[PDB]
C-alpha cells in the first residue's frame, strides 16, 4: 500500500520525462488522413451520447455529419497524441493542425 504509492510516483515521473515539449515539436503540422478519420468517428461517438455540441445542427441527424461540421469550424475539443517509436509523444490539438 505504501509501495504502490511509490510505484505510481515512478510511473508518473518517468512519463513526464518522455513527453516532448510543445515548443520542441518536430512532426508534421498537417493533420494526417488517419488522424482526421478517427477524430471524426470518435467525436461522432461522443455526440451520439449527448456530448455538449459546439455548433448549430441545422436539421442534421447524422452524428458523423455533426462532427464534420464541428471540424470545419474548428470546434472539436479533442487532442491527438502522436507516438514516436520510443514511446515518447507530441500532443497536438485538433484546432491547431492544418486540415486537408
Amino acid at each position: 500500500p505504501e509501495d504502490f504509492q511509490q510505484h505510481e510516483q515512478i510511473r508518473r515521473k518517468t512519463l513526464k520525462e518522455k513527453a516532448i515539449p510543445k515548443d520542441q515539436r518536430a512532426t508534421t503540422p498537417y493533420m494526417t488522413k488517419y488522424e482526421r478519420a478517427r477524430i471524426l468517428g470518435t467525436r461522432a461517438l461522443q455526440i451520439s451520447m449527448n456530448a455538449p455540441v459546439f455548433v448549430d445542427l441545422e436539421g442534421e441527424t447524422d452524428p458523423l455529419r455533426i462532427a464534420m461540421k464541428e471540424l470545419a469550424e474548428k470546434k472539436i475539443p479533442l487532442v491527438i497524441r502522436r507516438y514516436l517509436p520510443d514511446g515518447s509523444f507530441e500532443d497536438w490539438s485538433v484546432e491547431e493542425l492544418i486540415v486537408d
Binding site: 461517438l45 451520439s48 451520447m49 449527448n50 445542427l57 442534421e60 441527424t61 447524422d62 452524428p63
Partner: protein, 567 residues
C-alpha cells in the same frame, strides 16, 4: 462487443512458462480418477471426466460455481500420475542436458571455466550488450589461474552492465532486438555443441556411461567400456574426501546437475534478466500431474443422429486404466514380504512394472504427440492428440484465429446497374430487412426512431428490437401496432436507476441509404477488392446491383460471380 460495456483493465504482455504440480493441485476443482464417464442413467460419474466440479454439463449445474451450461466458464481439474513422466514437448532438451552431464561430479562435463565464459556472454546479451560479449572473450592475463580468470571476467560483466544502465543503453528489463536475439541463439547452439562434444569430464576426469534414446521417449544407459573402466579407477583415489533407465532416475541426475550448474542455466533459460529470481528446476522437463481441461471442452459429438464419444476422453480413460493397474502392482509390491517373495518373483514383478510404465508413458506421449505413440491395433487410424488438434490442416491458428467465420454479412450474385452511383451498392430488401445496425436514441433522432419502431420488423425502414438501459432486449416481432406505438413513446424516458443513468436506449433499426457497407469479391489480392459503398435499397431486387465502374477494382465479370456485403 458493446460500446456501452467498456473495459478498464488491459492486457499488456504475455509471459510463457511451465505449470508446476504444486500450482495445479492447488487450483484444481476436482481430482479425476474414474475411467468411466457416465452411468446407466446418463449422469456424470463422480470423480470421472464429466464430474460436475469441472463445469456444468447438459442440464446439470456446475458444482463449483453453481452456474448453468451457459454462464459457467468451466474449471480445470487434474489427474495424479502415480509415477513421473517426461513431458513429451520438452524431451529433446532434456536429452541434451542429460547427455552433457557427468554422473560423478554432477557438473557438465565441459570444463567449468568455459561454462562460466558462456554464462558471462549470455548474461551480457540479456542487456543487449553485443560489443561487450566479444570483449569478454578478450580476457586473459591450471586451477589457480582459472579462478582469477573467472573472477576478472565476472567483474567485467558487472562493470559493463552497470555502465550500460547508468547511460542510455539498457534497463533492468533488458534490451532485446533481432541482432541481439541472433547472437544469443548462436551462443546457445555453440554452447550445446560444446556440451555434447566432451567424453571424459574436464573437471573430475571420469567417464560417465553414454545415454541413448527412442522416438517414443525411452532412455537407455550403455554401461562402461574397458579402457574407460580402467581410466575410472585410476582416478579412484582422488575421489576420497544397455538398460532402460526410469524417468525417476533421470530426474534425480538432472536435479543435482541443475543445482550445480545453476549459474549458466539461469541465463540459458532466460532471454531477459530474471527479475522474478526463480530457480531453474529440472522438474520443468517432467510432470507428475496432468491438467484435465474444463468439461465444456470435452463433450461428445453428434454425426447426424448417432452420438460419438469425445476422442480426448478416449485417450484420458486409457491413462486412467493404466493408472489403476499400476496402483495394484504397487500394492502387491510391498504387499509381499521379500523373505517369501523371490529374486525369482522380484524379477517378474519388475517385468510387469516396467511393462505398465512403458505403455502408460506411450499413451501419454501419443496424445501431446501421437507421432510418438505406437500404432494401435494395426488399422483404426490414430486418434488425434493435442498436437494434431492444434495442427489439423492449416491449423487452429490460421483457420480460427487469423481468419474466422463472420456474421451479419450477406452474400449474393452480383448484377450490373448503370443507374446507381459509382460509389453505391444496390441492396435487395431481403437483406435490408434482416441487417441490424444499433442506434442510440437521442433528442436529435427521437422522431426517426419512433417511426422505425412503429413500422416494425417488416415494413422498411423499420426496426426489429429495442435495447433498454439495463441491456435487456425487447423483440418487436410478435407485436401489434398499438404495443409498438407504446414502446415508441417510452424511448426517451428519464432514468429510474442511478447505475444506468448514463445510458440511453438503442433501437435496432433496419438498413438505411444513410449507411455504409463493405463489399468484397474473392480472391482479395489488393485493397480495392474490398471497398466501402454507400447503401441504396432497391425494391423488388433479389441480387446485389453494382455499377460497372467498379468491375476493374473487384475484377468482377457478372458471370454469376458472388460478392459479400459486410455491415
Amino acid at each position: 462487443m458493446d460500446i456501452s460495456k467498456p473495459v478498464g483493465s488491459e492486457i499488456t504482455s504475455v509471459d510463457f512458462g511451465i505449470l508446476t504440480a504444486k500450482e495445479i493441485r492447488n487450483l484444481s476443482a476436482k481430482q479425476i480418477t474414474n475411467p468411466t464417464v457416465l452411468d446407466n442413467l446418463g449422469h456424470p460419474v463422480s470423480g470421472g471426466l464429466y464430474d460436475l466440479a469441472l463445469g456444468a454439463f447438459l442440464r446439470n449445474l456446475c458444482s463449483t460455481c453453481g452456474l448453468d451450461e451457459k454462464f459457467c466458464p468451466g474449471h480445470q481439474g487434474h489427474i495424479e500420475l502415480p509415477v513421473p513422466c517426461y513431458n513429451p514437448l520438452f524431451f529433446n532438451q532434456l536429452y541434451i542436458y542429460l547427455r552433457a552431464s557427468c554422473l560423478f561430479c554432477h557438473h557438465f562435463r565441459l570444463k567449468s571455466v568455459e561454462v562460466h565464459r558462456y554464462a558471462c556472454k549470455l548474461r551480457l546479451l540479456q542487456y543487449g550488450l553485443i560489443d561487450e560479449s566479444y570483449k569478454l572473450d578478450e580476457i586473459t592475463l591450471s586451477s589457480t589461474l582459472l579462478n582469477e580468470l573467472k573472477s576478472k571476467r565476472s567483474e567485467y560483466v558487472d562493470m559493463a552492465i552497470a555502465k550500460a544502465l547508468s547511460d542510455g543503453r539498457t534497463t533492468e528489463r533488458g534490451s532485446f532486438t533481432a541482432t541481439v536475439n541472433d547472437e544469443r541463439k548462436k551462443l546457445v547452439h555453440e554452447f550445446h555443441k560444446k556440451l555434447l562434444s566432451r567424453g571424459k569430464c574436464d573437471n573430475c576426469g571420469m567417464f560417465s556411461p553414454k545415454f541413448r534414446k527412442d522416438g517414443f521417449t525411452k532412455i537407455f544407459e550403455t554401461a562402461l567400456n574397458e579402457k574407460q573402466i580402467t581410466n575410472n579407477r585410476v582416478k579412484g583415489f582422488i575421489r576420497q574426501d544397455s538398460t532402460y533407465i526410469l524417468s525417476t532416475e533421470v530426474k534425480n541426475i538432472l536435479d543435482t546437475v541443475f543445482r550445480k550448474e545453476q549459474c549458466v542455466l539461469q541465463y540459458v533459460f532466460h532471454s531477459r534478466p530474471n527479475l522474478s529470481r526463480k530457480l531453474v528446476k529440472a522438474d520443468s522437463f517432467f510432470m507428475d500431474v496432468l491438467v484435465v481441461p474444463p468439461t465444456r471442452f470435452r463433450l461428445p459429438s453428434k454425426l447426424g443422429e448417432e452420438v460419438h464419444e469425445n476422442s480426448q476422453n478416449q485417450l484420458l480413460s486409457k491413462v486412467l486404466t493404466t493408472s489403476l493397474l499400476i496402483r495394484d502392482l504397487n500394492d502387491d509390491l510391498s504387499k509381499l514380504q521379500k523373505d517369501k517373495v523371490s529374486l525369482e518373483d522380484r524379477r517378474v514383478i519388475f517385468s510387469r512394472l516396467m511393462n505398465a510404465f512403458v505403455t502408460i508413458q506411450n499413451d501419454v506421449n501419443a496424445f501431446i504427440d501421437s507421432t510418438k505413440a505406437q500404432g494401435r491395433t494395426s488399422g483404426k487410424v490414430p486418434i488425434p492428440g493435442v498436437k494434431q488438434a492444434l495442427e489439423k490442416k492449416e491449423g487452429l491458428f490460421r483457420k480460427h484465429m487469423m481468419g474466422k467465420r463472420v456474421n451479419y454479412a450477406a452474400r449474393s450474385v452480383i448484377s450490373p446497374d448503370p443507374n446507381i452511383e459509382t460509389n453505391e451498392i444496390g441492396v435487395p430488401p431481403v437483406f435490408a430487412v434482416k441487417l441490424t445496425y444499433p442506434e442510440p436514441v437521442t433528442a436529435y433522432n427521437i422522431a426517426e426512431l419512433r417511426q422505425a419502431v412503429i413500422n416494425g420488423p417488416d415494413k422498411w425502414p423499420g426496426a426489429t428490437q429495442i435495447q433498454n438501459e439495463d441491456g435487456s432486449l425487447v423483440s418487436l416481432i410478435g407485436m401489434s401496432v398499438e404495443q409498438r406505438k407504446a414502446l415508441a413513446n417510452q424511448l426517451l424516458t428519464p432514468s429510474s436507476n442511478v447505475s444506468t443513468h448514463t445510458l440511453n436506449k438503442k433501437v435496432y433499426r433496419h438498413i438505411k441509404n444513410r449507411d455504409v457497407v463493405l463489399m468484397n469479391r474473392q480472391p482479395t489480392l489488393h485493397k480495392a477488392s474490398m471497398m466501402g459503398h454507400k447503401v441504396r435499397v432497391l425494391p423488388n431486387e433479389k441480387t446485389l446491383r453494382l455499377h460497372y465502374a467498379n468491375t476493374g477494382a473487384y475484377n468482377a465479370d457478372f458471370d454469376g460471380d458472388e460478392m459479400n456485403m459486410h455491415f
